[PDB]
Amino acid sequence: TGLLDGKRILVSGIITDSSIAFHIARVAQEQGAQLVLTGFDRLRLIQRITDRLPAKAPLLELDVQNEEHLASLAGRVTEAIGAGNKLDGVVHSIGFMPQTGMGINPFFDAPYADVSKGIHISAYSYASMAKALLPIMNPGGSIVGMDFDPSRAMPAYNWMTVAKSALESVNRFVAREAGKYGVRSNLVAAGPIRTLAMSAIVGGALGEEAGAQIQLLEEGWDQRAPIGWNMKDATPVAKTVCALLSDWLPATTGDIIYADGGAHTQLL
Amino acid sequence: TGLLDGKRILVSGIITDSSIAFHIARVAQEQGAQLVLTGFDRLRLIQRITDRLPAKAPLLELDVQNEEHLASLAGRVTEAIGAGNKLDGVVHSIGFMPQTGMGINPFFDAPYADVSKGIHISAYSYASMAKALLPIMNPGGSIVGMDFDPSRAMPAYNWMTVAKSALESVNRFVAREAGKYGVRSNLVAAGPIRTLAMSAIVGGALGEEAGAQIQLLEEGWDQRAPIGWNMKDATPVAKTVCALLSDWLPATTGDIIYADGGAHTQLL
Amino acid sequence: TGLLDGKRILVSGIITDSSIAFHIARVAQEQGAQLVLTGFDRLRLIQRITDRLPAKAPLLELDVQNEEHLASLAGRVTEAIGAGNKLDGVVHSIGFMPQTGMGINPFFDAPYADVSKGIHISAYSYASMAKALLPIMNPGGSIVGMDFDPSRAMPAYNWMTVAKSALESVNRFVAREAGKYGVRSNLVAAGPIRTLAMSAIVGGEAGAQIQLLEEGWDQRAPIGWNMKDATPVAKTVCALLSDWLPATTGDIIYADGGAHTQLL
Amino acid sequence: TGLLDGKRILVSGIITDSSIAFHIARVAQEQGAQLVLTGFDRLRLIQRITDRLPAKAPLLELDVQNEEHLASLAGRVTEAIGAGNKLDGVVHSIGFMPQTGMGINPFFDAPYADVSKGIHISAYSYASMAKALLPIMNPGGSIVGMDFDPSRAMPAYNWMTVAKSALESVNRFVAREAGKYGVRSNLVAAGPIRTLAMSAIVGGALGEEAGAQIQLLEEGWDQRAPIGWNMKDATPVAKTVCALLSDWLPATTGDIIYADGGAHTQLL
Ligand SMILES: NC(=O)c1ccc[n+]([C@@H]2O[C@H](COP(=O)([O-])OP(=O)(O)OC[C@H]3O[C@@H](n4cnc5c(N)ncnc54)[C@H](O)[C@@H]3O)[C@@H](O)[C@H]2O)c1
Ligand SMILES: NC(=O)c1ccc[n+]([C@@H]2O[C@H](COP(=O)([O-])OP(=O)(O)OC[C@H]3O[C@@H](n4cnc5c(N)ncnc54)[C@H](O)[C@@H]3O)[C@@H](O)[C@H]2O)c1
Ligand SMILES: NC(=O)c1ccc[n+]([C@@H]2O[C@H](COP(=O)([O-])OP(=O)(O)OC[C@H]3O[C@@H](n4cnc5c(N)ncnc54)[C@H](O)[C@@H]3O)[C@@H](O)[C@H]2O)c1
Ligand SMILES: NC(=O)c1ccc[n+]([C@@H]2O[C@H](COP(=O)([O-])OP(=O)(O)OC[C@H]3O[C@@H](n4cnc5c(N)ncnc54)[C@H](O)[C@@H]3O)[C@@H](O)[C@H]2O)c1
Ligand SMILES: N#Cc1ccccc1Oc1ccc(Cn2cc(C3CCCCC3)nn2)cc1O
Ligand SMILES: N#Cc1ccccc1Oc1ccc(Cn2cc(C3CCCCC3)nn2)cc1O
Ligand SMILES: N#Cc1ccccc1Oc1ccc(Cn2cc(C3CCCCC3)nn2)cc1O
Ligand SMILES: N#Cc1ccccc1Oc1ccc(Cn2cc(C3CCCCC3)nn2)cc1O
């Protein structure tokens, strides 16, 4: 008997089999959830990736910058899960920032057109997904997004840090709106996981400093985490998200759960 | 469901069937946990109270101020759960503060002897329980204590606030020690629940200020919580603790989970 | 001897004589600072307002959305304070959010074009000002922006809350950049002050707004809070522009009567 | 001319000319304050140390664990500053923790009698000092204590971390009491300064680890602080305290000002 038996959950943000969203979906399925997946831009590729999941699941296009995709999303989900059924959970596992807002590119040289795009996708879209999907969510349901602790500044993450600070504020407002429907909204602040975004976005922006990134991640997380931290294992983050999709954190909303091995609780 | 199937968990802090610990134990048992219970001072009464749980469970004396009780605790638990078995979870649901450190008694008039006693039982005992029990916990295990958000001052809670600020710090250190054993340590910051200790804050169930207390608790929690808050329902807090005793938050330690309906995330 | 004797400080954000920036400038001047002022859009009006300050001060146009204004700003400031002199302080006291992102307008109905504009002006501009001005700041100097505590959600402030959360993060990054020049960057999280922007949050129910501000601030503040008195906020900013908080950067000072430290 | 012209300020916590309190007093005096000083245990020594201040100032015995010293303190201060005059400021720069609660001594082995003592002196005494002195403080006045950021756990500081978490909570309650008198109460969270407490208490407790751990700390502070940090220079901390004793932060109470070079705002 699974933790998410007969729960219908939408999971956004799969692009490879390392994606945090991919492992969220895998664990959600292992625990009995029926999924609907959304993907951006490269749907042929994403389709081959989602075939490696333990179960088949419908896949829908969603570019969170596209008003038409958002306006139609609720309709397309209803059609995929059966007319008269609703969602019990929604997972926002999406982010973007142009190269200029990251890495060794100077912080002050990022033009606002680039920063604005990153905040649109990384923070505002949390509200636009909730707006589109709350009308088809059941009471008891849960919305979850992915965060990276932005309360202190750090090298390289630069304007993505600013986007996450924004996302944290958005989550608290979404929680107010979602409360009317009996729905929780929370973020999971994950420790670092090797994914495409880590490597191509953050690691690409670092140039020949990429060694520096690993060293910092080692300092900031495995060394600090009292139970350690393994950047090649997304399972603990995925389980944490499933905990929030479940009935087992029923009194938590507008909040942030840290799945970082405890690193943020330790100074060194 | 079986969230805690075949997990052996020690639960401290039962005194009535309204105790947060009582509901923690009930839900743990409903989810398949084999419990060991500890009780303070009034064991005859506590025995009759624990009989109302869904399953029988051994009951052990533990006054956290008593060195002998603590020195023997590990031994007595091993005897109750079977030689060669260990605990998978531990719940600290314990607190105390003398009357002088609370309510309308002026903050500056609490003598240190009284405050010290309250900090001993409410904060330091979180470390002494961990010290006694870690040697008989399995890797994967979880220690959980109960908090009330002390980051801002408030009427009446007075020196208990100071004890909770201390407990929050103790938890982060216990997390470091527990990490060596592959064990997590976390607090649940609960919203207010009608218990015997709550009445104590204002001098018993008809204290001068009882009416004021209820109004403030409604202002601070049900009115702020986006999903609302019901002070007569401990279940959501109990489920939140079981979430932490389970395998489903494996990467969270040294931390605090808020089970307050989201109230601490909202200003008004 | 005044607290800012012979310090050259740029102050942005004056629009009326209730503007927080206006009272910052007044106090800075009372304490011996030579000011340069910047104003947006309504410079004729702003000029008449700045005439009510204790001392005359040059006034420069700056729309923080305008790349040309920002590119020329350093040059225009050098010309106004004398070639070979630099700034010792900079005050960002600027904000904006379209009506759709605020008040009773549902949170979800604000389009991103509107939210983006508000974040541009209210948060990103803190970085673009620092970028423009750091090259002409002296070691020891201080940059200060105005914040409103966004760590918990609230009625009406809506997307401005999100812009302030962003500003807080921007400040921490600016602090890193400013450190290279020996310059501090901090925000002052003020309690509520009756200004033109405050009326904008709703328009001018206003009754509800005042009640909430009394609940959230005067009632919680252990030393009380008076929304018609900007002086304490202005002094707190001058403290940060002075030499007296030399080891504080990337940080937030709360000038709210202590309200954020009390739950009820 | 001076920032504290004609302000009468009590400064506790001088033991050597490296003490943070000694530099607070020096700068206060340079800025025109008339001081009253308090000292613990070694008054002969403290007297020779205070002679090296720019101005003479009366010195009073105060062991914050002694009820008689506290009961008589207001009276003795009135006598020293002139009957009818009051204090405008009070500086608590006092701390203690037994060796067992610090360094490489295991966290769980500190007996509560030792931790209690440390909390008494390091946290509760901030309330007793305020209780004794508020009745002779002018409206506008300021109380200030010294903190070391305890929001995350760390090596070695151990139970002192817990005492600082307690102090932070006590400061918020003192702010409530002090508000009735028109008085502010705040802490300054200083970066690390080479003082007797650093070397004898913390450094002593580290044993053979003292040298390396302290060097890494000095490197990592200075590394995180965007404006850098020099552990041999107390002046910036002393100035920060004088800012709070002055009229220039009139709307800040119950709060914490970080004088750490910005280090706590940066993760790495
Ligand atoms: N990798 C880490 O260590 C880490 C840690 C904590 C949080 N995060 C967050 O987790 C989330 C997922 O990142 P990940 O590491 O799995 O990376 P990723 O590259 O696997 O995923 C990023 C996803 O965002 C999608 N995306 C980008 N622009 C989009 C748009 N306009 N519309 C819809 N989808 C769009 C991509 O298509 C992709 O599926 C992000 O919010 C990221 O900040 C990453
Ligand atoms: N009830 C609430 O609103 C609320 C909210 C948040 C946190 N909490 C915390 O929850 C915990 C439990 O309190 P409760 O509300 O269940 O009340 P309660 O009165 O039911 O239980 C408190 C328990 O503490 C025990 N205790 C006291 N001194 C002890 C000692 N010397 N040794 C061992 N046990 C001792 C008592 O025997 C009792 O079982 C406390 O830590 C309290 O601060 C309560
Ligand atoms: N009044 C309050 O209660 C309060 C509380 C905390 C923080 N704040 C902050 O203080 C700052 C000033 O607000 P105030 O209440 O004194 O307001 P205000 O309405 O007096 O001033 C707002 C100013 O922003 C300027 N501005 C707007 N868009 C601009 C742009 N593109 N370029 C340059 N200037 C631009 C306006 O011209 C005006 O000078 C803001 O950042 C605001 O968020 C206000
Ligand atoms: N030095 C640092 O790196 C650092 C950083 C931040 C905060 N602090 C804090 O600053 C304060 C001052 O410590 P310091 O480094 O100046 O060291 P220190 O040893 O110079 O000063 C400590 C003082 O505490 C006094 N004291 C101890 N027990 C007392 C008692 N029973 N009654 C009265 N006074 C008592 C001692 O006599 C001494 O004057 C402490 O609260 C410490 O926690 C230290
Ligand atoms: N999706 C997405 C995404 C978009 C922009 C930037 C990062 C994105 O994904 C992340 C991918 C990885 C991480 C974790 N992380 C952050 C970093 C940097 C590099 C130095 C260490 C600390 C900051 N390295 N790993 C956080 C993320 O938000
Ligand atoms: N065990 C225990 C215990 C010991 C002393 C004081 C309280 C204790 O348990 C609690 C009991 C109730 C609550 C919740 N609560 C808080 C308050 C104050 C006073 C009324 C409004 C502001 C919070 N009243 N009830 C929190 C608790 O930690
Ligand atoms: N400049 C500017 C500005 C731009 C958009 C929105 C607000 C702006 O300035 C402010 C003006 C007033 C306040 C304080 N405030 C907040 C509020 C509402 C009222 C209900 C409770 C708190 C949110 N009322 N006043 C904070 C501000 O940042
Ligand atoms: N007075 C006093 C006092 C009492 C007990 C312990 C420390 C005390 O003063 C301090 C002396 C130094 C510091 C700063 N600090 C912290 C540390 C440890 C060293 C290991 C790494 C960082 C934590 N070393 N210095 C902080 C202090 O509160």
* DSSP labels, chain D: --TTTT-EEEEE--SSTTSHHHHHHHHHHHTTPEEEEEE-S-HHHHHHHHTTSSS---EEE--TT-HHHHHHHHHHHHHHH-TT--EEEEEE------GGGSTTS-GGG--HHHHHHHHIIIIIHHHHHHHHHGGGEEEEEEEEEEE---SSB-TTTHHHHHHHHHHHHHHHHHHHHHHTTT-EEEEEEE-----HIIIIIIIHHHGGGHHHHHHHHHHHHHHH-TT---TT--HHHHHHHHHHHSTT-TT--SEEEEESTTGGGB--
Q: In which residue are the tokens 């909430």 written?
A: C212
Residue with tokens 């946990």: B33
How far apart CA A43 and CA A51 sit, in angstroms, is: 12
The burial class, CB within 10 Å (0-12 / 13-18 / 19+), for D97 is: buried
Q: C63: exposed, middle or buried (C-beta count within 10 Å: 0-12, 13-18, 19+)?
A: middle
Q: How far is C262 from chain B (nearest CA, A)?
A: 5
**C-alpha of residue B157 to centroid of ligand 6, in Å:** 6
The verdict on a CB contact (< 8 Å) between C165 and A169 is: yes
Name, in order, each residue with C-beta under 8 angstroms of B164's C-beta and a sequence gap of 6 or more.
B122, B123, B147, B148, B149, B150, D169
Question: Are the Cβ atoms of D119 and B120 closer than 8 angstroms?
Answer: no
Distance CA A4, CA A246 (A): 6
Question: How far separated are the first and last CA of chain B, in Å rounded?
Answer: 37
What's the rounded Cα separation, in Å, for the pair B132 and D227? 45
Instruction: Tally C-beta pairs within 8 A across B and C.
Output: 32
Whole-number Å distance between alpha carbons of D147 and A222 = 28
Query: What gap in Å lies between CA C61 and CA C38, rounded to an integer?
Result: 6
Given a contact cutoff of 8 angstroms between Cβ atoms, the answer to whether D39 and D46 are in contact is yes
Q: From the CB of residue B73, how many other CB atoms can be counted at a distance below 10 Å?
A: 23
| Amino acid identity for residue A239 in this structure | K
User: What are the tokens at A161?
Assistant: 């840090």
Q: Which of residues 167-196 of C touch D (CB under 8 A)?
A: 172, 175-176, 178-179, 182-184, 191
Comparing CA positions, the residue from B199, B232, B228 lying closest to residue B213 is B199
Domain that holds residue D92: 1-268
Instruction: State if residue C197 touches ligand 3 by the CB under 6 angstroms criterion.
Output: yes
Neighbours of A82 (CB within 10 A): 10
CA-C42 nearest atom, ligand 3: 37
- Percent of residues in chain A assigned helix, strand, coil, to nearest 5: 50, 15, 35
- Look at the block and give the residue holding tokens 């025109």: D32
| Chain C interface disruption, residue of D227, D232, D258, most C CBs within 10 A | D227
Q: Cβ(B197) to ligand 6 under 6 A? A: yes
- The reply to whether B75 touches chain C by the CB within 8 Å rule is no
Q: Burial code of C93-124, b = ≥16 C-beta within 10 A, e = fewer?
A: bbbbbbebbbbebebeebebebbbbbbbbbbb
d(CA A14, CA A236): 17
Contact between B115 and D125 under an 8 Å Cβ cutoff? The reply is: no
User: Where are the strands (E) in chain A, listed by range?
Assistant: 8-12, 34-39, 59-61, 87-92, 137-147, 184-190, 255-259
Helix (H) or strand (E) holding B192: none
Q: Across the strands, what pairs with A144?
A: A91, A186
Give me the residues of D, 82-121, that contact B with CB < 8 A: 106-108, 112, 115-116, 119-120
Identify whether the C-beta of residue B124 lies closer than 8 Å to the C-beta of residue B78.
Answer: no
Task: Report the alpha-carbon distance of residue B139 to residue B131 in Å, rounded.
Answer: 15
Distance CA B64, CA B122 (A): 9
Q: CA–CA separation, C169 vs A28, rounded Å?
A: 33
Closest CA–CA distance from residue D200 to any residue of chain C (Å): 26
Exposure string for A92-127, b = 16+ CB within 10 A, e = fewer: bbbbbbbebbbbebebeebebebbbbbbbbbbbbbb
Q: Give the pairing type, strands C184-190 and B137-147.
A: unpaired
- Confirm whether residue D169 is marked as ligand binding: no
* Strand duo C251-255 + D8-12: pairing: unpaired
SS3 A262: coil
- Kindly compute the dihedral angle of the four CA atoms of residues A32, A37, A42, A45, in this order, to the nearest 10 degrees: 20
Q: Distance between CA D161 and CA D148 in Å, rounded? A: 8
What is the number of alpha carbons within 13 Å of residue A231 lying toward its C-beta? Answer: 18
Is the distance from CB of B231 to CB of B185 less than 8 angstroms? no
CB of B198 sitting under 6 A from ligand 6: yes
Give the closest-approach CA distance of D29 to chain B in angstroms.
Answer: 31
Amino acid at A54: P
Residue B261 near chain A (CB below 8 Å): yes
Protein residues with CB under 6 Å of any ligand 4 atom: D 13-16, 19-21, 40, 62-65, 93-96, 121, 146, 148, 190, 192-193, 195-198
Chain D residue with CA closest to A156: the answer is: D268
d(CA D69, CA D53): 25
- Do C168 and C124 touch, CB atoms closer than 8 A? no
DSSP C126: H
Specify burial of residue A191 (Cβ count, 10 A radius: 0-12, 13-18, 19+): buried
Q: C173: which chain A residues are within 8 Å (Cβ-Cβ)?
A: 107, 153, 158, 161-162
Can you tell me the distance from the alpha carbon of B236 to that of A249, in angstroms, rounded to the nearest whole number?
Answer: 7
Residues annotated within a binding site of A: 19-20, 63-64, 94-95, 157, 164, 193
CA nearest neighbour of B47 among B20, B74, B17: B17
CA-to-CA separations, B72 to A114, B63, C231, in angstroms, rounded: 63, 12, 63
Binding-site residue set of A for substrate? 157
Rounded Cα distance between A213 and C8, Å, is: 40
How far is it, in rounded angstroms, from Cα C85 to Cα C96?
32
User: What is the distance in A from the centroid of ligand 7 to the CA of C97?
Assistant: 10
Shortest CA distance from C149: residue in chain B: B267
User: Hey, what amino acid is at A123?
Assistant: A
B148 lines ligand 6 (CB under 6 A): yes
DSSP string, B193-214: ---HHHHHHTTSTT-TTHHHHH
Give the closest-approach CA distance of A56 to chain B in angstroms.
24
In sequence order, the 6+-apart residues with CB closer than 8 A to the CB of B12 are: B21, B37, B38, B39, B62, B90, B91, B92, B93, B94, B129
D229 lines ligand 8 (CB under 6 A): no
CB of B210 sitting under 6 A from ligand 6: no
The answer to whether residues A266 and A221 touch, using CB atoms and an 8 Å cutoff, is no
Query: B268: which strand partners?
Result: none
CA distance B163 to B216: 21
Give B162's contacts in chain D (Cβ within 8 Å).
123, 166, 169-170, 173
**Residues ≥6 apart with Cβ < 8 Å to A157:** A102, A148, A150, A202
DSSP letter (8 states) at residue A86:
-
Q: Cβ contact (<8 Å) for C172 and A164?
A: no
Which residues, other chains included, contact B157 with Cβ-Cβ below 8 Å and sequence gap of 6+? Answer: B102, B148, B150, B201
Is D40's C-beta closer than 6 angstroms to any atom of ligand 8? Answer: no
E strand residue ranges, B2-136: 8-12, 34-39, 59-61, 87-92
Which of A193, A262, A241, A189 is CA-nearest to residue B184? Answer: A262
Q: Which of B201, B202, B229, B231 has the most ligand 6 atoms within 8 A of CB, as the residue to mutate?
A: B201
- Amino acid identity of residue D9, one-letter, is I
- Burial of residue D82 (number of CB atoms within 10 Å: 0-12, 13-18, 19+): exposed
Residue A238 has which token pair?
């995925």
Kind of pairing, strands A34-39 and A255-259?
Answer: unpaired
Contact (CB<8Å) B240/A249: yes
Task: Write A49-58 long-range contacts (CB < 8 A, 24+).
Answer: A49/A14, A49/A15, A49/A16, A49/A17, A49/A19, A49/A22, A50/A14, A50/A25, A52/A17, A53/A22, A53/A25, A53/A26, A53/A29, A54/A26, A54/A29, A54/A30, A55/A29, A57/A25, A57/A29
Check residue D261 and give left, alpha or beta (phi > 0: left; psi -120 to 50: alpha). Answer: left
CA angle B78/B82/B87 to nearest 5° reads 55
Is the separation of the CB atoms in C136 and C87 below 8 Å? yes
D60, D37 Cβ separation under 8 angstroms: yes
Length of chain B as a residue count: 268
Q: Which residues pair with B90 in a beta bridge?
A: B10, B143
The shortest CB-CB distance from B166 to any of D153, D158, D162 is to D162
Q: Is B157 marked as a binding-site residue?
A: yes
Ligand 6 atom closest to Cα of B216?
Answer: 21
Domain total for chain B?
1
Q: Which ligand is nearest to the CA of D24?
A: 4
CA distance D81 to C98: 57
Using the Cβ of D237 and the Cβ atoms of chain C, whether some distance falls under 8 Å is answered with: yes
Let me know: does C25 contact C32? Beta carbons within 8 Å: no
* Chain D closest-CA separation from residue B165 CA (Å): 6
Task: Supply the DSSP symbol for C85.
Answer: -
**Phi, psi at residue C141, to the nearest 5°?**
-70, 175
Q: Are the Cβ atoms of D251 and C256 closer than 8 angstroms? A: yes
Closest by CA to A123, choosing from B222, D174, C110, is C110
| Separation in Å, CA C151 to CA A164, B82, C161, C201, C251 | 13, 49, 8, 19, 14
Distance between CA atoms of B154 and B161, rounded to whole angstroms?
8
Tell me the C-alpha distance between D214 and A189, whole Å: 31
In degrees, rounded to 5, the angle at the alpha carbon of residue A203 between the alpha carbons of residues A200 and A208 is: 125
B145 lines ligand 6 (CB under 6 A): no
* Residue B262 to chain A, least CA–CA distance (Å): 5
As given in the structure block, the two tokens for residue D75 are: 């009276």
Q: Which residues pair with D90 in a beta bridge?
A: D10, D143
8 Å CB contact of D251 and C232: yes
Which among C128, C168, C250 is the nearest to A165, CB-wise? C168
Sign of CA dihedral A239, A245, A251, A253: positive
Question: Cα–Cα distance between A159 and A165 in angstroms, integer?
Answer: 10
For residues A25, A31, A33, A36, the Cα torsion angle rounded to the nearest 10 degrees is 10
Q: Is A145 exposed, middle or buried (0-12, 13-18, 19+ CB in 10 A)?
A: buried
Resolution (Å) of this entry: 2.6
User: What CATH number is associated with residue C193?
Assistant: 3.40.50.720
Euclidean distance between CA atoms B261 and B213, whole angstroms: 19
Q: Which residues is C207 bridged to in the sheet?
A: none
For residue C89, give the nearest of C45, C162, C48, C35 by alpha carbon. Answer: C35
**Spatial separation of the C-alpha atoms in residues A91 and A185, rounded to whole Å:** 10
- Residue C167 contacts residue C147 (beta carbons within 8 Å): yes
Experimental method: X-ray
Q: Which chains contact A through at least 3 pairs of Cβ atoms less than 8 Å apart?
A: B, C, D
Contact criterion met (CB < 8 Å) for B169 and D164 = yes
Chain breaks of chain C after residues with C–N above 2.5 Å: 204
Under 8 Å between Cβ of B102 and B156: yes
Helix D158-179 with D125-133: angle, nearest 10 deg: 20
What backbone torsions phi and psi does residue A34 show, to the nearest 5 degrees? -95, 120
Residue numbers in A near B226 (CB within 8 A): 175-176, 178-179, 253-254
A247 and B CB contact within 8 Å: yes
Name the residue among A164, A153, A83, A151 with its Cα closest to residue A118: A164
Contacts of B2 (CB under 8 A, 6+ apart): A1, B31, B32
Contact A170, A163 (CB under 8 A): no
Residue C112 backbone zone (phi > 0: left; psi -120 to 50: alpha; other: beta): alpha
